[PDB]
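Progress note, sequence design subtask.
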C-alpha cells in the first residue's frame, strides 16, 4: 500500500546491479515482480504463482529482467516450472508466501543474480524495495522499475514490516540490504492498510530456496 506521500522514484539505469536482476514477470491474468537468484531461477511470492481461493496455478508467462520504459533492455525468458512450498498450498499463510520459477534460458548468467542472506531479526535494518508497481504503469503508460528505501520498523518471528510504499505488482519484490543481499520478500499490506510487510529469509525460507535452486 501507498502510505501518506509516495516516496518511490523511477530507476534511472536498469542495466546495472541490482536493478538488472529485478524482473517484471507476467502470467495469464496478472503480473508481479521477481528477482534472479540463480542463472535460471526467479524468486517471487507464492500468491503470484498459486491461487488459494481457486486452487489453481497461474498460467506461465515471461520474465523481463530490468525492463524499463516498456523496453526489454536485458532481454527476456519464458517460465517453465514453478516451485511452491507445501506450507503455502496447505495454508495460504504469509509466512510461506514465496516461490521460485525456473526459466527456459540461463538469463542470470548475463545479467547476474542476487545472493540470499539468512537472518533471524531485521528491525532497524535499512532495506530497498524495487519492483514493478501497477499504479505507475497506469499513470505513465509504461512498464518501468520504481524503488524506495527505508527501515524495517517492526517484526515478528516470521515477517518484517515497513512503511516503504508498494502497490499491486510489487508482490515478490525482494527486501535488499545494503550489500544487495536478499533478506526477505515483500508480500502484502497489513494492519488495515497502514503498514507493508513480508516473510523474512529465515532458516525455513533458505532451506526451501536451496531445494528449488537444485531443480
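Output:
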Amino acid at each position: 500500500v501507498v502510505i501518506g506521500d509516495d516516496g518511490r522514484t523511477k530507476v534511472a539505469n536498469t542495466r546495472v546491479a541490482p536493478y538488472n536482476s529485478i524482473a517484471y514477470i507476467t502470467f495469464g491474468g496478472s503480473s508481479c515482480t521477481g528477482t534472479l537468484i540463480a542463472p535460471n531461477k526467479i524468486l517471487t511470492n507464492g500468491h503470484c504463482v498459486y491461487n488459494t481461493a481457486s486452487r489453481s496455478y497461474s498460467a506461465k508467462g515471461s520474465v523481463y529482467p530490468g525492463m524499463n520504459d516498456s523496453t526489454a533492455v536485458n532481454g527476456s525468458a519464458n517460465m517453465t516450472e514453478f516451485y511452491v512450498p507445501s506450507g503455502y498450498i496447505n495454508t495460504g499463510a504469509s509466512q510461506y508466501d514465496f516461490a521460485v520459477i525456473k526459466t527456459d534460458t540461463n538469463i542470470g548468467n548475463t545479467v547476474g543474480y542476487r545472493s540470499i542472506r539468512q537472518v533471524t531479526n531485521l528491525t532497524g535494518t535499512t532495506i530497498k524495495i524495487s519492483g514493478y508497481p501497477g499504479d505507475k504503469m497506469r499513470s505513465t503508460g509504461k512498464v518501468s522499475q520504481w524503488e524506495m528505501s527505508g527501515s524495517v520498523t517492526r517484526e515478528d518471528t516470521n515477517l518484517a514490516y515497513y512503511t516503504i510504499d508498494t502497490f499491486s505488482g510489487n508482490s515478490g519484490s525482494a527486501m535488499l540490504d545494503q550489500n544487495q543481499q536478499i533478506v526477505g520478500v515483500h508480500n502484502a499490506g497489513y494492519s488495515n492498510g497502514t503498514i507493508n510487510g513480508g516473510p523474512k529469509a529465515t532458516a525455513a525460507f533458505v532451506e526451501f530456496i536451496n531445494y528449488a535452486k537444485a531443480q
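The longest helix spans residues 203-213. Work on this subtask will continue into the next period as scheduled.
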